[PDB]
Amino acid sequence: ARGPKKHLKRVAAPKHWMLDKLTGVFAPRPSTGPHKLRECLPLIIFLRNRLKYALTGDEVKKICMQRFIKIDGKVRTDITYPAGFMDVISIDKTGENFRLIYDTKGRFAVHRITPEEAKYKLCKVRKIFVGTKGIPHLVTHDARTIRYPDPLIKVNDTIQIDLETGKITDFIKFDTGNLCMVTGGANLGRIGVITNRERHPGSFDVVHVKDANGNSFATRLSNIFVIGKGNKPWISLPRGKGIRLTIAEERDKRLAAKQSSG
Amino acid sequence: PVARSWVCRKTYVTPRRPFEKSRLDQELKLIGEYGLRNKREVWRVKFTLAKIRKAARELLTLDEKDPRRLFEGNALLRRLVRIGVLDEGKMKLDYILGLKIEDFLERRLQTQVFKLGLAKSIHHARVLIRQRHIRVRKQVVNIPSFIVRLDSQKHIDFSLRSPYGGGRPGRVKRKNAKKGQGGAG
Amino acid sequence: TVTIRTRKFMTNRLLQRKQMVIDVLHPGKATVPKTEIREKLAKMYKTTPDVIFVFGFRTHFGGGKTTGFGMIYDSLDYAKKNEPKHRLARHGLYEKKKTSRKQRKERKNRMKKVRGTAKANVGA
Amino acid sequence: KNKEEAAEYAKLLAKRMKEAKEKRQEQIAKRRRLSSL
RNA sequence: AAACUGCGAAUGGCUCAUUAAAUCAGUUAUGGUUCCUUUGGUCGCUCGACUUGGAUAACUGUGGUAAUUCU
RNA sequence: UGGUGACUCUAGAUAACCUCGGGCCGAUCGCACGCCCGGCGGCGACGACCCAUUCGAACGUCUGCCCUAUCAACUUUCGAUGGUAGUCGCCGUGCCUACCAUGGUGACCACGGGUGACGGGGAAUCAGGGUUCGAUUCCGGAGAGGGAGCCUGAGAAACGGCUACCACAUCCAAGGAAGGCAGCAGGCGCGCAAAU
RNA sequence: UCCCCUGCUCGGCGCCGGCCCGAAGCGUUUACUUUGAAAAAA
């Protein structure tokens, strides 16, 4: 190709977008944004599939530019905006708010939340930047540059920011024993506690995370996000509590629900 | 770059021996006894039985205390006892290999309509099915190759629009009655 | 008689309509025309039948089950705002210009061949 | 906004530097204590 | 309507001629470089007019070649 | 000051430079209206030097491809291998110049030739091992008759952009002018072989 | 089936300079074998 791509096929889409094949040929390619092309969710696919507020690609456009969707407290007009991870999607008309958190499987799910919890947002810093006159900077995972942070902010730790002021409120240190939640790979959405971390120079440092039912799993350091201090999370976790239940017991739960419901 | 499916598979298989006396005799005995039409339907019954037997053999190759083997065996066994080819007493993975063709052909809709007690012969049962008479749980079914389940066994009855189950008279009866009224009036 | 039953009913404050799935039960008779579902939803929800939009009615195999959608608006101008043009053409509210694509493309090319004010008079 | 944010960062940096200085002072005292005992 | 300006025409679509460590695939690096657009930051941090200038469009009018999205 | 496994990293200070083909430091636009004695004001659009971020692209590291010995040695002052100093390039690099040393690969199959060879995810047959195909809807590469050169633009050696060559070819009042369906329909030929 | 027959400098399940535990730092190299990550979809 002589330039950047602008189209995207339906079968080339990620599974968590989680579409069909007989509907169309092209998939909604998201515009460039704070999050990457893969682990992002477009607003069109969310409003058309997860909430069923529209049937076609034009009604969702009318909803999106009628100034009723608040992304991180701000209105967004672009229909293919990448709504990333821990992004607060608020609708001031119906009075319902959402937060995009992975469930036990590898997908996004709707999560209706209280409005007052929507005032804050968790994000993970990527690197430490010194400005042109000795101004320290933070670059979070959603590319939100923060001027003059706390001097105790490390390279791989999370912070709690306010949506209105935009400054930092409090932070969690990346330490052993804090509550964790993976954000990529085979293990996705599992709620675990950090137990071990080995360092490999010039490579990826794999950490060991222990699940809340005694299970153990290991992922890379880049797929690690801290949500709480100790064992108590700072946000309201969805149904299933990130437990990653296997096939036999979810089959038992499904047959029990079918027997009780009839 | 069109939006189609292009997914299909053959449901039968042709035998290696084209002319064998015992095989033709057994196939024609099955066709005559169970009211079939041609050899492709008994070949497709043989093909799906062969697929089930191959899956059971591949599952029985692996050792016990395996979650994949236990899950797939329980799912296959539950589906087979839901269809109506097995029972709760023979609830084992190694009892699958003792199943035959007539156990599958007994669960056909044509045979069940014949043997439930509302049709004279099996060919009359197939003719009655193909002309939109027999329904299962308020759903008109006009095909003979409908594998009924155990929970839907006691809901085989004539449709509401058929003259056999109570409905409007057919074309021959109405035409003959019109001829009789015209001749007598 | 003919009765309908709603299913998956929901309201939409942010688009000023209500979505529903309509299950038409017509044993014996054929598929009822859409004005019957419109007036039945009018006298079911106590609404003027000018804001009842129904479509997508497919008759099931078996003679008497019909599944279709339905939009219940709260106003006529609000229904005029967020609606495709072909449904308003079906209800006799919108009219389309009757010109085929080949004439429009040829007229565009003929206007492309000439510059200035003569584009107004080269394509009538 | 630039002026008030710089003043707030200067206050926070002064507090953190004071905490680091007293941490180094008590670590030097601990080193002297273990050297004596 | 027209025309100046800005943006896009480098995407999509078709084919397999050349290409036998070339292409491609898995794993790595840019601490050896550019990056339209979106998002966030910076945008009185420099110590020295209550709004400046003339050219072209569109338009009017005069023409040539047999001919062009010509002038 | 801060960080990497590691800097000639980021930041700090000193002394200067700072391209007239010229880095920035707003002579732009809409809606709603105004408080306090002409100053002072909220919400947006556009543009903008730089630094991250997003879609990328580009050059790299290790490993993995069909046949042929009736191809046994191949490459080299026309760079082949390496050193140094530079030009150019967005960057590393014989990519290329100037001077040096004679290096580099090869029976573990280099080099030369052929392919009715685009590569891969895949497809058919199929006890176990294998064999054959993959032009073909997804990813990557290449081309728009075939070579060569370039303007604009962030992004092209672009062809539904331009400039010449050869082969074919259209109009012509004979001086000149306009082109490239391996895009969608369609036609000719080629054929056993393929639709409005 | 169950635990045992590689060494020293910073420091925490604890007791009153004395003992166990953790750990910044390294240990003769290959294949084979088992686990774990990541490995686009259809």
From Swiss-Prot, chain A:
One of its GO terms (cellular component) is cytosolic small ribosomal subunit. Pfam families: 40S_S4_C, KOW, Ribosomal_S4e, RS4NT. It is found in: Cytoplasm; Nucleus, Nucleolus. The keyword Ribosomal protein applies. It comes from the Eukaryota. The modification N6-acetyllysine is found at residue 232. InterPro entries: KOW, Rib_uL2_dom2, Ribosomal_eS4, Ribosomal_eS4_C, Ribosomal_eS4_central_region, Ribosomal_eS4_central_sf, Ribosomal_eS4_KOW, Ribosomal_eS4_N. Keywords: Acetylation, Cytoplasm, Isopeptide bond, Nucleus, Ribonucleoprotein, Ribosomal protein, RNA-binding, rRNA-binding, Ubl conjugation. Belongs to the eukaryotic ribosomal protein eS4 family. Component of the small ribosomal subunit. Part of the small subunit (SSU) processome, composed of more than 70 proteins and the RNA chaperone small nucleolar RNA (snoRNA) U3. Identified in a IGF2BP1-dependent mRNP granule complex containing untranslated mRNAs. This is Small ribosomal subunit protein eS4. The lineage of its organism: Eukaryota, Metazoa, Chordata, Craniata, Vertebrata. The gene is RPS4X.
From Swiss-Prot, chain B:
GO terms for biological process: ribosomal small subunit biogenesis; translation. It is found in: Cytoplasm; Nucleus, Nucleolus. Keywords: Acetylation, Cytoplasm, Isopeptide bond, Nucleus, Phosphoprotein, Ribonucleoprotein, Ribosomal protein, RNA-binding, rRNA-binding, Ubl conjugation. Component of the small ribosomal subunit. The ribosome is a large ribonucleoprotein complex responsible for the synthesis of proteins in the cell. Part of the small subunit (SSU) processome, first precursor of the small eukaryotic ribosomal subunit. During the assembly of the SSU processome in the nucleolus, many ribosome biogenesis factors, an RNA chaperone and ribosomal proteins associate with the nascent pre-rRNA and work in concert to generate RNA folding, modifications, rearrangements and cleavage as well as targeted degradation of pre-ribosomal RNA by the RNA exosome. Its main location: cytoplasm. It comes from Oryctolagus cuniculus. The gene is RPS9. The modification N6-acetyllysine is found at residues 65, 115, 154. The modification Phosphoserine is found at residues 152, 162. The keyword Ubl conjugation applies. GO terms for molecular function: rRNA binding; structural constituent of ribosome. It comes from the Eukaryota. Component of the small ribosomal subunit. Identified in a IGF2BP1-dependent mRNP granule complex containing untranslated mRNAs. Part of the small subunit (SSU) processome, composed of more than 70 proteins and the RNA chaperone small nucleolar RNA (snoRNA) U3. Residues 161-185 are annotated as: Disordered. There is a cross-link at residues 92, 138 (Glycyl lysine isopeptide (Lys-Gly) (interchain with G-Cter in SUMO2)). InterPro entries: Ribosomal_uS4, Ribosomal_uS4_CS, Ribosomal_uS4_euk/arc, Ribosomal_uS4_N, S4_RNA-bd, S4_RNA-bd_sf. It holds the Pfam family S4. CDD domains: S4. Belongs to the universal ribosomal protein uS4 family. GO terms for cellular component: cytosolic ribosome; cytosolic small ribosomal subunit; nucleolus. Residues 107-181 form the S4 RNA-binding domain. This is Small ribosomal subunit protein uS4. The lineage of its organism: Eukaryota, Metazoa, Chordata, Craniata, Vertebrata.
Swiss-Prot record, chain D:
The modification N6-acetyllysine is found at residue 11. Ribosomal protein S6 is the major substrate of protein kinases in eukaryote ribosomes. The phosphorylation is stimulated by growth factors, tumor promoting agents, and mitogens. It is dephosphorylated at growth arrest. Phosphorylated at Ser-35 and Ser-36 by RPS6KA1 and RPS6KA3; phosphorylation at these sites facilitates the assembly of the pre-initiation complex. The modification Phosphoserine is found at residues 35-36. It comes from the Eukaryota. It is found in: Cytoplasm; Nucleus, Nucleolus. Transmembrane segments: none annotated. Residues 17-37 are annotated as: Disordered. Residues 17-29 have a biased composition (Basic and acidic residues). Component of the small ribosomal subunit. Part of the small subunit (SSU) processome, composed of more than 70 proteins and the RNA chaperone small nucleolar RNA (snoRNA) U3. Belongs to the eukaryotic ribosomal protein eS6 family. Component of the 40S small ribosomal subunit. Plays an important role in controlling cell growth and proliferation through the selective translation of particular classes of mRNA. Part of the small subunit (SSU) processome, first precursor of the small eukaryotic ribosomal subunit. This is Small ribosomal subunit protein eS6. The chain holds residues 201 to 237 of 249 of the full protein.
